[PDB]
Structures are given as structure tokens and as C-alpha cells.
């Protein structure tokens, strides 16, 4: 995640300081320079499994269109719960369904 300058509102561009040989966070339309906590500059992944458990909405318990289920709820121990599958459109999506309860809203896998 990349952030901007608080007062200049322009993007912080991390420029090296060879004299101290450290990482910084330097804007360009201003001169506000701040130290970089982690020497990481940019990070990118190849295999993505993020967003499968981050696409959660609270009011999902109020939808009747979704099927109900007697799948025992790990937390609320109810026997009337809905279940669905990840929203990811990747061709290789593995359909280990994200069973969701009326209350817990937890993406639990009982496998």
C-alpha cells in the first residue's frame, strides 16, 4: 500500500539516501521527507488467495435468496445458516464453500 504526503497531498516517492544508506519516503512537489520503517519498496505476488475471506458484508444474514442450512455454526451453534462461494472469477477457483452463519459471519471450513 502506497501513501501520499499529509500537507502536500502528493505521493511519497521513496528515494535512497546514500550518505546514510537508508530508505526514505520523499514527495516531489514538496520537500517533506520521512524515514521508511521497512526497507521494502514495492511488493507484488503471483498466486492470489486474497479477497476470498475479505469480501464480507454484515447484512448478509438478512437475505432469503441464499439457501439456508443446518450446518452447525461454530460460534452461535445455530442450525439455520446460509452458505455461498467466493466471488473470485478465476478459472481455477476451488469451491471449498465459505459457510456463513446467521451471527458469526465467519468463513469457516469444516473439512
Partner 1 sequence: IAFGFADRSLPHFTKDDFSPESKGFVENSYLRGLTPQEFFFHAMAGREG
Partner 2 sequence: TPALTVYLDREIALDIEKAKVIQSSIEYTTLKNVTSATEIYYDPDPTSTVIEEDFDTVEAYFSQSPWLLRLELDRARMLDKQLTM
Partner 3 sequence: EITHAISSAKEQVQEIIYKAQHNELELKPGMTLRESFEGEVSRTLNDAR
**φ, ψ dihedrals at 5, nearest 5°:** -90, 135
Pick the closer one to partner 1 by CB: 6 or 56: 56
The contacts found for 30-34 with CB under 8 angstroms, 24 or more apart, are 30/5, 32/5, 32/6, 32/7, 32/8
The reply to whether 96 sits near partner 3 by the rule CB under 8 A is: yes
Pick the closer one to partner 1 by CB: 11 or 97: 97
Q: Which of 66, 92, 107, 108 binds partner 3 (CB under 8 A)?
A: 92
What is the distance between the alpha carbons of residues 53 and 56, in angstroms, rounded to a whole number? 7
The reply to whether 53 sits near partner 3 by the rule CB under 8 A is: no
Q: Which of 5, 71, 86, 98 binds Zn ion (CB under 5 A)?
A: 5
Q: Are 83 and 95 in contact (CB under 8 A)?
A: no
Q: According to the annotation, is 81 in a ligand binding site?
A: no
Pick the closer one to partner 1 by CB: 32 or 83: 83
Residue numbers of the site for partner 1 (CB under 8 A)? 65-67, 83-85, 97
Length of the chain in terms of residues written: 111
Q: Which triple of cell numbers denotes residue 87?
A: 466471488
Which chain residues interact with Zn ion by CB under 5 A?
A: 5, 8, 10, 27, 29-30, 73, 76, 78, 101, 104
Amino acid at each position: 500500500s502506497f501513501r501520499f504526503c499529509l500537507e502536500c497531498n502528493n505521493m511519497l516517492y521513496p528515494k535512497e539516501d546514500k550518505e546514510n544508506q537508508r530508505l526514505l519516503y520523499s514527495c516531489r512537489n514538496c520537500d517533506y521527507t520521512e524515514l521508511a520503517e521497512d526497507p521494502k519498496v514495492y511488493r507484488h505476488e503471483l498466486i492470489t488467495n486474497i479477497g476470498e475471506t475479505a469480501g464480507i458484508v454484515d447484512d448478509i444474514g438478512q437475505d432469503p435468496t441464499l439457501p439456508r442450512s443446518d450446518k452447525e455454526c461454530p460460534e452461535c451453534h445455530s442450525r439455520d445458516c446460509v452458505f455461498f462461494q467466493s466471488q473470485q472469477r478465476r478459472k481455477d477457483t476451488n469451491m471449498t464453500l465459505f459457510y456463513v452463519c446467521l451471527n458469526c459471519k465467519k468463513t469457516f471450513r469444516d473439512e
